[PDB]
Every structure is written in structure tokens, then in C-alpha cells.
């Protein structure tokens, strides 16, 4: 049972919170690690499900949809609801709908950082950061071929091959690939993915490593991404009935594609005991295009106050008729990143030091060629009741273009010291960023520009007791430039994150147990809010606060029993906002929790059989920033049966059956507003056969 010591010992090492390889108890912030072994056991559809058992994340906010890996960490999402996702310590920099995803089959691990981490990464969400690690060429040869078949016509064929080219293993390669096909939960919606990952390592000695990393993915269809009202999902229609969980409000000819290409490397060289150099670089090109009709709530919803079609209807039919809009989109983006680090280890008497000095540079360019449908651009949908829609016939009466060229670039210089005095470890660091943006509206012929200069720092202490108990404290900061323009025609100043945290990490050297506790106060200042003088323009100066308690526990109970689990208390509130002061932001539950357990038989006739089951609980959340309605709580149960084929003379090979949402519960995952609700995932049953040679 490889997942057992992986979740408890291999997962003690991390680099995401410090950019140095530091054990988790020596990191003065909250961090969680999901290994490839845990991902091989659980078989998560995406990286988000891989984090289901870690605290302080909302991995299921969007329900059945699997288009993006959006995460709500400690009550917060990135500026413009973009992902804040990293790959091999470099940002997968996105813009508008052009955001990249990495299939969990291609990953070695995923590490999640909670709270502000600008001190090492530059502009970042106050909530946190996700960093994924690509599968690397292995020492021992690997010859894996995998097959999947499940519910909603799911079909997958994968392969994972690695070996040395020479006898000394100084040249090694890896090649991981997959082809997936399935139907979305929603009728007429399909998903397709073809991904390949070529990798090459050059290891001339035990002190040098140059690894070429590339990723190529093509998705002709990414599936459902629509919106549905609280009327027919959370609440029943006037009828008293609700819409089915497979309900699709789009057009029969809705299409949505994505294409990704990346090349880069990871370099590290150790000169001596004092100095180590690191460099990470990536060039990536991302494309997306969609023709999507989608929902905009019922005609009795204030969002549809200017809709003619809605105004025409009787006040007895408004409550069960659905107003719809549309988006036609075509995007091409190019992204480049280089992070260069010098690591200096030395002592000053009784104090040992690990000094990190680095230069980080990223540039992103995104070219948007879109068309939007406004009020009365698509016919109403009677919710008491699928045909094609003309996307090419763009009517000047109700639709218009959106052609933008977005540019971003950021340079950061940063210093960090991990100074160890006996059992006292002090982490202190600072970063200086020059973040510059430039947006060309090709229709209006106008360019909006803003150059930001920002300083962030982090100061922490960990007291290392010999028994494995490690209390810690930290202050940490983040900044995020705005992309929005005020009444006065200028881009707004950045938003900032300021966090205080106290916690205790229980990481004993002699037991397979990882238990952490953390209490925090995270504040987002210069948040955009409604104009008090009333206009179609926002005003800066707003504030959001999140205070909470987070508990994670991971232990090997017996030789056959493994447990993973978490609990989160999140108290999020608008402390300063024109419209919502005192309210709780939408899609943020007060209470969340999860618990998983697995049993592996090692001696009788059931030798090599793993049985596992886990439950994920989400408390109630608010469905809108006005806090006019609530989304009800839910508990989802997953289960798996896995059998090692070693007893049948095929060691390394296994067959498994996964069941997600075992009791097939019907629930609304969340609502971001009265017109934007998402049905949770219906029961899924999957069979996987993975063979080693």
C-alpha cells in the first residue's frame, strides 16, 4: 500500500512555501502535499479532487463542470476569477477564458499554499496558491499502460514509460500520454482530451540535474460551463418541481475547445556545501474558442429588468421562463517565465543560515477576438418544457464585438533567510516587484496602462520540540494589481493581503503521523466596490476579512489501515463595502470537513485487496453577495475496491472500481448569484486496469 507512507513520510518534504527543500514542520505557513501514490489510489478526475481531503479549499464550487481548476482558498479567488495555479514553481499564467489545466495522470505531486505568498512569487491571490509537479524521468524503468471505462460513456487509454538511455543512467527520458472521451452530466454536452508529456533528464553527476519538461494537450470539446437559476435548483419552480441534474440550458450546437503547448526546463547545480544554483524556465502557448449560449436567470430576476422578451410576459409566466445570452470567443496567449535562484548555506556561531537570493521574470500576452450577446440576443427557454443557434449572424441590435490585446510582465527580486538557532527556526524575507500591464481595446482604439511597484515581506518563527510538536507564528503579505479602470479613466491601484497565523504542526520523526492546526486572520484591502454616488463604474477602498481554524490529520493507524481527513471553520465577511458591509461573500461555507479510510488485506485469501471509503461534507453557503438566499449543506460519499494482481503473477499491475457520490445525492454545489447555480456531480462508477511491464 504505497499511498500509506507517501501521505505520511514522503509528503513531509516540500519546496513551495520556501523555494528551498524544507520539511513541512519547518515552514512557517500552512501547506498540504498530495503525492502521486495518493492520486493513483483515489484516481481524481482533476487536481481539484486530489485536494478534497486538505483544509481551507473549495474544490467543488462549480459542480459537474471540469473546464477549469478554479479553487476558493481561505474565502478568496484570484483577480478576475482566474486560476492562481503553478507548474514546477512557475505560473500557468492565464487571462479571460484562456486558462490552462494539467491532467493528474501527468503529475508527480500537488502542493497547496494557504495565505499570502507574494514574498516568493510576486502578484498572487491573498487566499493562496497551487503548485503542481510534473512526472520526472525515473531511476528504475517503468512500462505502464492503463485503461478506464465508466458511467456517462467514459473511456480512457493511458501510458507512462521511463528509462535510462546509457548504462550509468546519466541520460533518462519519460513519456506519459492519454486519450479520454466522455459525456458530460448535462444532455448533449461531451468531453475530449488528448495529452502527451515528453521529458528528458541529464544527470552527469550526483550534484547536477538538467531536466527538459514539455506538455501538449488538445481538447476538441471541454464540456458544460453553463449557468442555471436558483428557481428550479435550490428552490422549486412555481410548479413545485425542479430542473433535472442533467439539465442543459445551452444550444445544441454549443462548442468549447482548448489547446496547450509548453516547453521548458528545471536546472540545479550544487557547487559545494555553501552554494547551490537553480533555474526554472517555461515557454507556453494556450488557445481557447467557444460558441456558448448560457443562462441569465428567470424573468422575475432583477438581472433581467431591461429585457424586452421578459417584460412582454405575464407576471404568472416570468418565474418559469429563462432568459439566456451568448458568447463567441477566440483567444491565443503566449507566456514565458524564468526564475533564477542562488542558495547560500553558512553559519554565524550558533546560528545556521540558508540564504536564498533570486530574480523572477514573467511575461504574458493574450489576444481576445470575441462577440457578446446582450439582452434579448437569444430566445427564452420555457422551464416547463434542444435546437441550434446562429452564432455567425451577429445582430447589431442586441450583440457586439470584444477585441482586446492584454499584456502583463513582472520582474521580482527577492531575499529569504531560514536561520536556525538550536530548536528556534526564524524565516524572514522580502520581495520587490515591478508589475506592468497594457490593454489595447482594438474597437475603441484606446490603451490602458499601469506600472506597479510593490514590496511584500514575510516573518515567521517555528519552535521545534524533540517529540515532533512544532508551534509556529507568521505575518505574511500579498498584492494583486487591478485590471479595472475607474470613473477618472485610470487603472485602479492594487489590492493587498495581510495575514497573521498561529498554529502547531505535529510531525514526529518516529511515527507515521502528520497532524496540523492553524488559526488565522486574513484581510484583503483595496477591494473594488459599488460607487456610492451611483454609476456603471466601481470605486476602490473596500475590505474583506477571513478568520478561521484549519485542521488536517494523516496517519498510518495499523499496517493495513490508513486515514486522511480535515476540518475547516471559515468566518468571511465584508468589513468595508458600499452595498455588502457585514455580509458573507457567496460560495463560502462556515463549515467544511472530510474523512477517508482504507483497509488493505495482506495475509488470508483476500491478500492484496484494498477497500476504501470516504465522506466529504460542505456546510451551507450564501448564493449571492446580497445574502438574499442560502445554499443547503450536503455530504457526499466515495468508495473504492482495488486488487493487486501480484498473487496472479503480475506484480505492479492492479484493477480497481471507483464510486463517486455513492448514495447519488442531488445537490446544488453552489451559487455565485440568483442566476448562477451549479448542480453537483451525480454518482459516478469507474473501472480502471493499470498494467506494469
Amino acid at each position: 500500500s504505497a499511498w500509506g507512507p507517501a501521505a505520511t513520510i514522503a509528503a513531509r518534504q516540500s519546496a513551495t512555501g520556501t523555494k528551498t527543500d524544507t520539511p513541512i514542520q519547518k515552514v512557517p505557513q500552512s501547506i498540504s502535499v498530495v503525492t502521486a501514490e495518493e492520486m493513483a489510489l483515489h484516481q481524481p478526475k482533476s487536481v481539484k479532487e486530489a485536494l478534497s481531503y486538505t483544509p481551507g479549499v473549495s474544490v467543488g464550487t462549480r459542480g459537474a463542470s471540469n473546464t477549469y481548476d478554479h479553487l476558493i482558498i481561505r474565502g478568496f479567488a484570484a483577480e478576475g476569477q482566474s486560476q492562481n495555479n503553478y507548474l514546477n514553481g512557475l505560473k500557468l499564467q492565464g487571462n479571460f477564458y484562456n486558462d490552462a489545466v494539467i491532467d493528474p495522470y501527468m503529475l508527480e505531486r500537488a502542493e497547496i499554499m494557504r495565505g499570502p505568498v507574494s514574498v516568493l512569487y510576486g502578484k498572487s491571490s491573498p487566499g493562496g496558491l497551487l503548485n503542481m509537479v510534473s512526472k520526472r524521468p525515473t531511476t528504475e524503468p517503468l512500462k505502464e499502460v492503463q485503461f478506464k471505462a465508466g458511467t456517462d460513456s467514459l473511456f480512457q487509454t493511458g501510458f507512462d514509460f521511463s528509462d535510462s538511455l546509457d548504462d550509468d543512467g546519466v541520460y533518462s527520458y519519460r513519456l506519459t500520454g492519454l486519450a479520454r472521451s466522455a459525456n458530460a452530466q448535462q444532455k448533449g454536452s461531451e468531453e475530449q482530451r488528448y495529452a502527451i508529456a515528453p521529458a528528458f533528464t541529464w544527470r552527469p553527476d550526483d550534484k547536477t540535474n538538467f531536466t527538459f519538461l514539455s506538455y501538449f494537450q488538445n481538447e476538441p470539446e471541454t464540456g458544460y460551463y453553463g449557468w442555471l437559476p436558483k428557481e428550479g435548483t435550490v428552490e422549486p419552480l412555481p410548479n413545485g418541481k425542479r430542473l433535472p441534474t442533467d439539465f442543459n440550458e445551452g444550444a445544441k450546437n454549443n462548442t468549447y475547445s482548448r489547446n496547450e503547448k509548453m516547453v521548458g526546463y528545471s536546472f540545479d547545480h550544487e557547487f559545494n556545501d555553501t552554494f547551490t544554483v537553480r533555474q526554472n524556465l517555461r515557454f507556453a502557448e494556450n488557445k481557447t474558442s467557444q460558441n456558448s449560449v448560457y443562462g441569465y436567470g428567470v424573468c422575475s430576476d432583477p438581472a433581467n429588468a431591461y429585457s424586452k422578451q421578459c417584460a412582454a410576459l405575464a407576471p404568472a409566466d416570468k418565474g418559469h421562463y429563462l432568459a439566456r445570452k451568448y458568447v463567441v470567443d477566440d483567444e491565443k496567449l503566449q507566456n514565458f517565465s524564468v526564475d533564477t535562484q542562488l542558495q547560500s548555506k553558512f553559519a554565524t556561531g550558533d546560528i545556521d543560515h540558508t540564504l536564498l537570493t533570486g530574480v523572477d521574470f514573467m511575461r504574458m500576452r493574450n489576444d481576445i477576438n470575441a462577440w457578446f450577446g446582450y439582452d434579448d440576443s437569444v430566445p427564452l427557454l420555457n422551464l416547463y418544457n434542444n435546437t441550434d443557434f446562429d452564432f455567425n449572424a451577429k445582430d447589431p441590435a442586441n450583440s457586439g464585438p470584444y477585441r482586446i490585446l492584454n499584456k502583463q510582465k513582472q520582474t521580482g527580486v527577492y531575499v529569504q533567510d531560514q536561520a536556525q538557532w538550536d530548536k528556534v527556526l526564524v524565516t524572514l524575507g522580502g520581495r520587490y516587484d515591478w508589475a506592468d500591464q497594457e490593454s489595447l481595446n482594438r474597437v475603441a482604439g484606446t490603451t490602458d496602462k499601469r506600472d506597479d511597484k510593490q514590496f511584500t515581506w514575510r516573518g515567521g518563527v517555528n519552535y521545534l520540540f524533540d517529540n515532533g510538536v512544532t508551534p509556529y507564528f507568521s505575518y505574511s503579505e500579498s498584492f494583486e494589481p487591478s485590471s479595472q479602470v475607474g470613473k477618472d479613466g485610470n487603472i485602479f491601484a492594487p489590492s493587498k493581503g495581510k495575514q497573521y497565523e498561529v498554529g502547531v504542526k505535529y510531525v514526529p520523526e518516529d511515527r507515521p503521523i502528520v497532524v496540523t492546526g492553524a488559526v488565522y486572520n486574513l484581510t484583503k484591502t483595496n477591494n473594488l466596490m459599488a460607487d456610492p454616488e451611483g454609476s456603471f463604474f466601481s470605486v476602490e477602498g473596500g475590505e474583506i476579512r477571513a478568520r478561521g481554524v484549519e485542521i488536517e490529520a494523516k496517519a498510518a493507524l495499523s499496517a493495513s489501515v490508513n486515514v486522511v481527513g480535515s476540518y475547516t471553520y471559515t468566518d468571511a465577511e465584508y468589513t468595508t463595502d458600499t452595498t455588502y458591509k457585514g455580509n458573507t461573500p457567496a460560495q463560502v461555507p462556515k463549515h467544511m470537513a472530510s474523512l477517508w479510510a482504507d483497509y488493505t488485506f495482506f495475509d488470508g485469501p483476500l491478500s492484496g485487496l484494498t477497500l476504501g471509503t470516504g465522506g466529504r461534507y460542505t456546510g451551507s453557503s450564501y448564493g449571492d453577495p446580497a445574502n438574499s438566499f442560502k445554499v443547503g449543506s450536503y455530504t457526499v460519499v466515495d468508495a473504492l475496491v482495488r486488487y493487486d494482481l501480484a498473487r496472479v503473477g503480475m506484480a505492479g499491475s492492479n484493477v480497481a472500481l471507483h464510486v463517486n457520490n455513492l448514495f447519488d445525492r442531488e445537490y446544488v454545489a453552489s451559487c455565485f448569484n440568483t442566476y448562477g447555480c451549479f448542480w453537483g456531480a451525480e454518482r459516478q462508477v469507474v473501472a480502471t486496469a493499470t498494467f506494469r511491464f
Binding site: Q81, Y294, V327, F372, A397, S482, A530, S538
Partner: peptide, 21 residues
Amino acid sequence: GGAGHVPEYFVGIGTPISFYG
């Protein structure tokens, strides 16, 4: 009125384009 993916409920032909997606 902010950043996002989907134009706000008030966005039209003669209106500046702001988002809520």
C-alpha cells in the same frame, strides 16, 4: 462593473463593457 468573463446585466451596445463572470 468588475473583472471576469461574462458582461454585467446592464452592459449593452452603447455601454462600457464590464464583467461579473
